[PDB]
UniProtKB/Swiss-Prot annotation:
Taxonomic placement: Bacteria, Pseudomonadati, Pseudomonadota, Gammaproteobacteria, Enterobacterales
GO BP terms: enzyme-directed rRNA pseudouridine synthesis
Record organism: Escherichia coli (strain K12)
Gene3D superfamilies on file: Pseudouridine synthase, RNA-binding S4 domain
Protein's gene: rluB
Record-annotated disulphide pairs: none
Location of region: Disordered: 251-278
The protein's name in its UniProt record: Ribosomal large subunit pseudouridine synthase B
Length: 278
RNA sequence: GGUUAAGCGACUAAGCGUACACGGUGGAUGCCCUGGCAGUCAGAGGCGAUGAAGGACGUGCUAAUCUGCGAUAAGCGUCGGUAAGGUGAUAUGAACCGUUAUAACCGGCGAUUUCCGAAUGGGGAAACCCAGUGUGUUUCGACACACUAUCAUUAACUGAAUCCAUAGGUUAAUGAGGCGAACCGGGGGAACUGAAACAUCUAAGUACCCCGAGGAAACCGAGAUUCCCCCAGUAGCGGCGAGCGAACGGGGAGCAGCCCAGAGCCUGAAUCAGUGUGUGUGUUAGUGGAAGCGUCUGGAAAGGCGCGCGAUACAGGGUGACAGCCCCGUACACAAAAAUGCACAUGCUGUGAGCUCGAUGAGUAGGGCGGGACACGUGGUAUCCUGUCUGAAUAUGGGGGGACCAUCCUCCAAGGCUAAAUACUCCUGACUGACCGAUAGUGAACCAGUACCGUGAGGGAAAGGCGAAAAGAACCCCGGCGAGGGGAGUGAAAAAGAACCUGAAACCGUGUACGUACAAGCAGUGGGAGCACGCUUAGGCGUGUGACUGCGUACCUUUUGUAUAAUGGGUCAGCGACUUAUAUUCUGUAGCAAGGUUAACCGAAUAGGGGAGCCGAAGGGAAAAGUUGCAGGGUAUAGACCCGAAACCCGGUGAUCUAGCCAUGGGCGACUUGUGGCUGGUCAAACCGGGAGAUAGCUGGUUCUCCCCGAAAGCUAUUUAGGUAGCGCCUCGUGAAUUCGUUAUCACGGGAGACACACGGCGGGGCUAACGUCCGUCGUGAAGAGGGAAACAACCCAGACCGCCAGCUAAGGUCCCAAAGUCAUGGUUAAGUGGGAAACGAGCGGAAGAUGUAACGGGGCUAAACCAUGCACCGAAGCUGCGGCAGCGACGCUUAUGCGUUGUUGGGUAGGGGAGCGUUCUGUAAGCCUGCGAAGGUGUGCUGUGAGGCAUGCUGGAGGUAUCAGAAGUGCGAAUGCUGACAUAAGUAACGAUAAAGCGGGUGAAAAGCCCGCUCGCCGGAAGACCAAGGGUUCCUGUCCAACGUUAAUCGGGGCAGGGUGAGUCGACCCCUAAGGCGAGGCGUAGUCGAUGGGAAACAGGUUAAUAUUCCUGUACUUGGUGUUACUGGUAACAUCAAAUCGUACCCCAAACCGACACGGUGGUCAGGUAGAGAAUACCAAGGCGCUUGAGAGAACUCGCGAGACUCAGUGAAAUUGAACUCGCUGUGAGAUGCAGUGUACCCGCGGCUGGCUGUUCGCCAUGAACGUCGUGAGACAGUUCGCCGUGGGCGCUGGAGAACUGAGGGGGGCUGCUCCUAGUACGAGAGGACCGGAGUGGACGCAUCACUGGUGUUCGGGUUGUCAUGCCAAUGGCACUGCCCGGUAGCUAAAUGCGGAAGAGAUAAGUGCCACGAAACUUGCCCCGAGAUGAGUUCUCCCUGACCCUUUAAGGGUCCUGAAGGAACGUUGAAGAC
């Protein structure tokens, strides 16, 4: 089948779409010898020979991990001011990369998923799937049980009547409380904009459970967890795509707990690494 | 001798790993095969309206299949050869026939030779249904036989528009509308590979397909034709790119050259053919046919020894082991009732010669008007075909002689024919081979054009190793009247017993010996100790096992690196990606010496004979004295080192199913059903076969072994780009001069690959401002062993051929780990300096920073460090010594290597050069070996520097091999390779589209679940039954339990046997009619056909073990013929006779059928009784029957004491993973489970591994700049936050068991607040105001809490609508969630009462004095835990008298006898309470 030229050089370990167009316009990488034109499409077949600016790159398994993004980081790559991001701890791949799913702010933590294919990263964001996820809200201010039922109905926000679904109580008698709000529409930052109407200011938003992936009880900040085969096959057939039978994860169920402990050690290590990069 | 203490020290494995012997699942290899591919010497190329090829049933004395056969049904008549046997085979028995000439089998000549398929009477579904017309007939009611869909030709007869002719119809005869290969011809017609680019071109008048025919097709000469052998990869043609592509002569004759235009004198002539008979010679079925007697070994003789016959015949195979002569086949000698072919007697019909007299081919050529095909668009344009309208000549016109004009001869237009060889191999017989032997060869060696799958078509698996002869287990024992196994018997052999000759690797077990429960994470070899079965007249000699130590960052592919969180393979066995054919060029080998070579054809078939070509023989000279094959080594081209491409084109399936529109027939209003027509940008040009075993140069992959040697990094010229000329140094061969003591240098020939650089010292280059960028060889971090810096291939050191318990260096170093001065002489001796860097100030503090120490690889080090000088040891595979300096290359002594020495020595991909084996087939080789035991497989030993070969033993019992050569499907570790046989994951997960289990009895060796019986409630106008499809014996009965079924399954929906379902009034066939079709002429009429309505009848009951409305019995109605009566052939009454075929059960609303879990779709018919307006609701009635399987316990969540989930008998999985004896942290190199160093482990499990936190946006505590969608730079979509720490069984701590203590190390016992008195205070002239110590009152539950004060509370006070119990009611109790619950005692749970963490004492940092003080983290000591703490203690009561032999006489073991204290035990036990 025929595909776009800017898409083949996207997941191969180069750039995205606008960055690839800035390279083919100067006369660097070319297909079949002649200089290709922007906006065309060719048939990708395992047999072509191209050189990325005079460098032979062999371009021909999907891996999805769960990184949790603490405070003081960015979900992008380049930054005009030079703030640290999240693409500084991902391992290197041979002819592959990682594609983030979603977008968060600085004061909004969450468990992001980094996939390899660009098609699956655009299905979970579309409202056609509607996946329910769990969040942990740590309120701090004047809040009672009378305002918990008013925000569950139609409340005017600024663009659309944003509301919640189910609000429970799981302890919280000291200085803060636990208002586990369940959401399923997605959007981008739809919890802080609803609690600022009262004394609540939303100090930190931490994501707990996403869809049906079991959260490992004992995972500190600064570190990614690669999902096994039994976990990546759930979100694959959830949309349209058939499940893949080829992977890399075997058993290592005790080797995996070794992972847990040594990795808590190495998250301490990566905090040290961020300090050093400072 | 007895007791006590200390050190060393036999004995605990339910497992895992290793070796020998003994089995099984699995059936490889060797060997064996009436079956093939491919050629030659004779032949054959058929069958085709008296019924084909390919294909269901029926047929034997018999239950069935294939071949064959057709109620005259593997048999019969006539005519021939052998008569001591047969009724085909798989595959035996039972039943018959033949014996002084009626058996069977083979060949020839006749009769006979279904429905259906080209099928002709009309439809049609290849085996469903009806025959139309005309005779005879012991059967006016029954059968058989014969003739007729067409077109064309000949003859006879008849006949319209339209007087003649012509169309149509009838009869007879001849001819044939059939199917499956190769090759040839005619009419049409493709894609892909390399094309510098492009509709130029090659591939390619091709593959495939249609019709028809044939047996094969179509300036020196000379006028049947074609093919093969030559001229010839030629003379020509093309952007003269790759390609395509002729003739004469000659070398070879396996050719044979006819008839008509013919009058006349003369015919059954000469040369020949067709149709009969007779003789002679052949082909196609048969018979006779010579030649080994015996003995030893062995159960058995085809081979051995001695003596012979035979040999025109030993071509091959079978006959108990390897066969001339024991059989079946070959020389020689004979037969003709039928048919056919090649020379010859006679006969009938025959297109017909010689001599004489004549002739040598008119609608043609050329020209004019209007088109197309010949490469050429109507060109400068030749040649080929010429409709309609026209039109010449016969040396006064035309062509040819290797084509200007001219001359002479031949030729100058419509005729009719021409064999064999050569092409082609689907069928028969004989013969042949350096082809193969069940993953080979063909899809297929047997029941392979198979089981199975799909709507049809296309395409498409596995499976014999039966034995010489079936001698294929009588009887007895166990068990279930089985399966399986053990004895006996038979046989040479029984681990070959219906998986059946020999039985490997891998996987899975038993017995013996060794190691492991304190061991170091893909650890193997070596060194060393202990122990066992055979060293052995002391000899730790060898193998397996082998605690502990030392050395070493596994292996392959892919790479600038592979020790990597970057990627690939589960293993074993079998199989697997030829360097061939056809040109040219180059090299090596060998025969006449100035004839080196022939191909095809021919030949006593490789020699002889034959020179028309290719390669050469006139050099010197710019120009005007050797070659052909085979083999080996390269390039290009039919596929050519290419596993599955994708896309496009061509040849057979494209309105069938779903969803619509116009015209609708019936049954009861946008209903439903059946048929037909119209509409192809997903059934809208899917798949398979042919092209095509095509094609993407890279990606995966150039495969077994072996000796020597061996090109590159960021580059140069510099265009036009993933490329053309070209690279010093280096290789093989040749040439080779002191050129730069075996050619290191120059030239020539052959083979024809890569390309991001980075750091440090010295020397150079933007503001040496940036520790960057830009340059050179060996050389630490990435195509060079090992050693050293803790480890390795971008500065250190070294050219590593092989053996050993040898000695001596350099770099790095010398305290221990771990072999290397605890050295000597001068300095240094309190900043953890020795364990980084800049600038500023005067060898110190030295951004002097958390590499388990408040920054060396480890423990340390206050000099045990560093610099300089002098003196030792240790230091690889270098130098040296010994042995062949194994192997290769020279000189000096030597003509086919016995050298006395020295030097280069295993870095490497691609490529190139010299010396290589094993296995299989043939000549060598009918020889030799060959039952005192072959080959292969399976062990050990010996030999060899190469892959190996030779011998012997066990198993096995039938044909095998070496030397001198040559020809290939040729040595296997991976391509997710393909086939077959097998693990871990795991004896675990799972028990599902949801009515409910349990109790009793009977059968059986075994009954949780199957069968049978009783009561209430889940199913129940449908989870029911009866019709129409699909299926065509799944429904009844009996026996059996291997396979089939999600467990069991004595049941059954499984197999076998028995048992097929009564039809003129059960359903309607045939025929007629409507819509919709077909319809000879013409381009829909006349007809032929086509129904769920109209079309004679029966509504009901009884009788089955299984299926009925039918037979028996009772009653009713109608349509023909015949006989009688009545009325005038028809009608009525009575009686008698006849009336075909097909379908038929179970299933039919989800079980028996179609998607594996009714993870749904599913036409149509019947709405009973009571109540109600109706089809809701009410009596959930009757009938069919009541999830496909159990027992305890009964969280959170969910549904309403129950129903699920989790843990358990039995049965019973997949994905992933190269393989396991699954150890942290720091550090190194782009996030280390596996290397090195330190701390810590008996095996199998479960629970821990950013709310414990923050008084309110900020701080603390570490268990239009992006990331993705697609889009022909066209922009939108939506979318952007902008093993360790702990807890349980079975064990151990020195034979063993039940307690109480001492308590190493860590989280835990050291965490918080207010008031009053001391105290308007110490110090101070005032104000503000102490510190320490003591008491009391608050948070958090530190263990709690029952006298009193609360709450909760399924066995007791105490009620209540209805119902139930005590006989009924009341008075008392219990059930529908604990029906709503109203109160309380004891045990448990708590917001209140008592006690209780800030101590007493000792030791620190910071801070404060001149030893004295010293905090919430540390320590005897105030809660609590703890001896798996391997370093492992003491006391204390106890527990603790059975013996005889063998032997190497000792920490020993076995048999007979015995079973203690304590612990362990689960039918005699639930106020103990989720588990």
């Amino acid at each position: 089948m025929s595909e776009k030229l800017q898409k083949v050089l996207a997941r191969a370990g180069h750039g995205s779409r606008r960055e690839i167009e800035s390279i083919i316009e100067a006369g660097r990488v070319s297909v079949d010898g002649k200089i290709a034109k922007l906006g065309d499409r060719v048939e990708v077949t395992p047999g072509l020979k191209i050189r990325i600016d005079g460098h032979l790159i062999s371009v021909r398994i999907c891996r999805v991990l769960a990184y949790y993004k603490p405070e003081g980081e960015l979900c992008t790559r380049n930054d005009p001011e030079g703030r640290p991001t999240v693409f500084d701890r991902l391992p290197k791949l041979r002819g592959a990369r990682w594609i983030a799913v979603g977008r968060l702010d600085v004061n909004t933590c969450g468990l992001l998923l980094f996939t390899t294919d660009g098609e699956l990263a655009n299905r979970l964001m579309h409202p056609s799937r509607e996946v329910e996820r769990e969040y942990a809200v740590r309120v701090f201010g004047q809040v009672d049980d009378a305002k918990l039922r008013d925000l569950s109905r139609g409340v005017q926000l600024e663009d659309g009547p944003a509301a919640f679904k189910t609000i429970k109580f799981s302890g919280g008698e000291g200085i803060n409380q636990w208002y586990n709000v369940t959401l399923t529409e997605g959007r981008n930052r739809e919890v802080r904009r609803l609690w600022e109407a009262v004394g609540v200011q939303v100090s930190r938003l931490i994501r707990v459970r996403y869809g049906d992936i079991p959260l490992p009880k004992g995972l500190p900040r600064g570190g990614w967890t690669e999902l096994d085969l039994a976990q990546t096959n759930y979100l694959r057939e959830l949309v349209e795509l058939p499940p893949e039978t080829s992977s890399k994860v075997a058993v290592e169920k005790d080797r995996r707990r070794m992972k847990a402990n040594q990795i808590r050690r190495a998250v301490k290590r990566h905090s040290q690494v961020s300090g050093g990069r400072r």
